[PDB]
Design an enzyme around this catalytic site. Structure first.
Site, short mmCIF file in Angstrom:
data_model
loop_
_atom_site.label_atom_id
_atom_site.label_comp_id
_atom_site.label_asym_id
_atom_site.label_seq_id
_atom_site.Cartn_x
_atom_site.Cartn_y
_atom_site.Cartn_z
N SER A 140 0.89 -1.17 0.00
CA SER A 140 0.00 0.00 0.00
C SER A 140 0.92 1.22 0.00
CB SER A 140 -0.95 -0.10 1.19
OG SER A 140 -1.87 0.95 1.03
N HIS A 327 -8.02 -5.30 -1.74
CA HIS A 327 -6.76 -4.64 -1.37
C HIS A 327 -6.06 -5.21 -0.10
CE1 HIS A 327 -3.59 -1.69 -1.03
NE2 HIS A 327 -4.03 -1.35 0.17
#
Ligand SMILES: CC(=O)OCC1=C(C(=O)O)N2C(=O)[C@@H](NC(=O)CCC[C@@H]([NH3+])C(=O)O)[C@H]2SC1
Ligand SMILES: CC(=O)OCC1=C(C(=O)O)N2C(=O)[C@@H](NC(=O)CCC[C@@H]([NH3+])C(=O)O)[C@H]2SC1
Lengths: 347, 349
Positions: A140, A327
């Site tokens: 991320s 994600h």
């Protein structure tokens, strides 16, 4: 600083003067960090883990299974370090830390970039005497730092593992995080960032986190978790409190101003700016072996942008995690990430 | 004074004196607003129903203008095109904004209504209008849910269906996004538990609910083309901020909080199989009409895969995947492509 206070033990390096790339000078700057394992005599078995947006440097708390003998972050072979980003509430300089001109920085903490963090973190590594980095690994926001670390060249940073991430701010992500900041800006308790520390814009924060948490999920993942009873928690009734519970615990233990400062870092992110005319040209300047780890179903950082990374970084392997998670796969499928990272670090 | 309805062009209102919701709750003196274009033929079997989206009125022309006209999908020379406003909407049908026959508007006390309730009361209206057969039902998003529900009347009453960008049942994903949106409203201190005065709406809650909704309607490629950075060494990333605020504000100024809650809750009741079959594929197999399923790959709310599933369990179905990078709102951004697909299907034998 109650946020830093809630953490386990960690080290703090202090940099007496640091020039942000804006040209703003920070004074007497704390940089918090945490390490595991020991440096070899050659001081070249260092593995840097770059944390996610809202975590502290204590990677063990959200990546526990990546640590240990024969695991990716093998404390028997490597000195593993994670340094807290500027702007974070968990020890490095940010809205929550003391302003050397009095009182915490609060709303007046300067804008910092991914590149600022990398520069200040490498200063700390220099003080610790690290002479070479075996690998940098980050997901991320971490993957953005990881990509930036690579620019030091293969002689200092031997390998990179960017995970679930991008080369540059996109309109999509800018919009999601701006939306989240607006929830905070519109909370009447925010008072322009001047809120008293024990009277946070809690609704704004919660709401920002519910949104963020959902962008971290995939449709299949929420569908498995919540669904209706056959034709003729886990039921759909339970969604309501699932959303509330988690966002509440987070708003109770994070700072609004740091949320704003941290998300704004995303807007500065571009590995090409000042270096190359385009992203593929900048990726081609990455000479180290790279393992790019992604999931098809990541709703924030697209499969295609990882495919692009793998195509322009000359020595790169793309690793697609077999998952339907979205994600936060790098946390939900930690074991698969561990194996991929370990395998790569073993060549 | 329903100011939301007041801001519309002229429309008709049917009045149903008694209507039993599937909850068992009885609505009295029930307005059903609608709008039509074109004329019924002698046989009264050239009726095309258009089912509107979550926040629109029955005035389909205002978001689908290019679908109307001679040689277009909604060809007012061939068809009687009608759109009826859903229960719970602020635009004419019974809802939080309409008068409570026990008094003062329903406000926060408007009963839960389902997709099936809308379909039932709407068919009552069509019956009064003398519709003997429906040539096609066409609908996107929430509309596609009603569309799928219309189809169960059977191929004798409903000849064809065009479900667009939709699903067969509420999913955890969508429940979460809309519950998140409602919570923005619940948490707005002006909401007052639904008892807010009509000219002092929970405007921040509403705005926020709609920023989120608006983004879920987009795709990453669409937002990326619209906003990006200057290369290495309106349209900049600076502009995102006010792009988000701008339409969310105009919407919160012209929609009702209670209606937003009532409308989004409809999504929770949606399940074409409940009471009818043991599973979604079994329920889809009961749909005998020709069906054209229109979708986009990049729809973030109703997945490509669930449309693929529809096409696979509905026995006489064609899947139409619009060549676009737009997300859920493709059916509006690529209206011409939807028009062509719809017209093509309606021209079929
Ligand atoms: O990108 C970054 C993320 C962060 C962040 O802080 O920015 N993360 C967290 O916070 C989180 N850790 C967890 O989410 C634990 C999982 C619990 C929950 N997601 C669930 O399974 O319901 C990761 S996942 C998403
Ligand atoms: O499902 C529902 C949608 C609705 C709704 O009302 O419920 N829509 C609208 O409202 C909108 N009509 C428009 O013209 C909006 C433009 C699309 C918007 N997301 C944007 O470009 O910002 C369609 S987009 C999809």
């Amino acid at each position: 600083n109650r946020f830093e206070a809630s953490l386990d033990a960690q080290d703090i390096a202090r940099i007496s003067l640091f020039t942000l790339e804006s040209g703003v000078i920070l004074r007497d700057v704390p940089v918090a960090y945490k390490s595991w394992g020991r440096m070899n005599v050659s001081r070249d078995n260092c593995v840097i883990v770059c944390h996610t947006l809202t975590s502290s440097a204590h990677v063990t708390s959200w990546w526990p299974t990546l640590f240990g003998q024969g695991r990716a972050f093998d404390t028997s072979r490597y000195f593993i370090i994670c340094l807290n980003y500027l702007g974070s509430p968990f020890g490095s300089a940010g809205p929550c830390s003391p302003d050397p001109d009095a009182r915490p920085y609060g709303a007046k903490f300067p804008r910092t970039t991914i590149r600022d963090d990398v520069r200040i973190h490498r200063q700390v590594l220099d003080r610790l005497g690290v002479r070479q980095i075996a690998a940098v690994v980050g997901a991320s926001m971490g993957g953005m730092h990881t990509l930036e670390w690579a620019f030091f060249g293969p002689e200092y940073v031997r390998k990179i593992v960017p995970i679930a991430t991008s080369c540059r701010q996109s309109g999509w992500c800018a919009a999601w995080f701006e939306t989240q900041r607006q929830c905070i800006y519109d909370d009447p308790k925010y008072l322009d960032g001047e809120y008293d520390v024990d009277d946070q814009p809690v609704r704004g924060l919660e709401t920002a986190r519910k949104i963020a948490n959902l962008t971290y999920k995939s449709k299949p993942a929420m569908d498995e978790r919540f669904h209706m009873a056959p034709g003729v928690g886990q039921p759909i009734e339970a969604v309501s409190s699932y959303l509330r519970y988690q966002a509440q615990k987070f708003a109770a233990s994070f700072d609004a101003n740091c949320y704003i400062a941290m998300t704004l870092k995303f807007d500065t992110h571009d590995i090409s700016r000042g270096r190359a005319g385009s992203i593929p040209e900048a990726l081609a300047m990455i000479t180290q072996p790279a393992l790019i780890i992604c999931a098809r179903s990541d709703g924030l950082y697209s499969f295609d942008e990882h495919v692009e990374m793998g195509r322009s970084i000359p020595n790169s392997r793309l690793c697609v995690v077999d998952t339907n998670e979205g994600h936060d796969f790098f946390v939900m499928e930690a074991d698969k990430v561990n194996d991929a990272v370990r395998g790569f670090l073993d060549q």
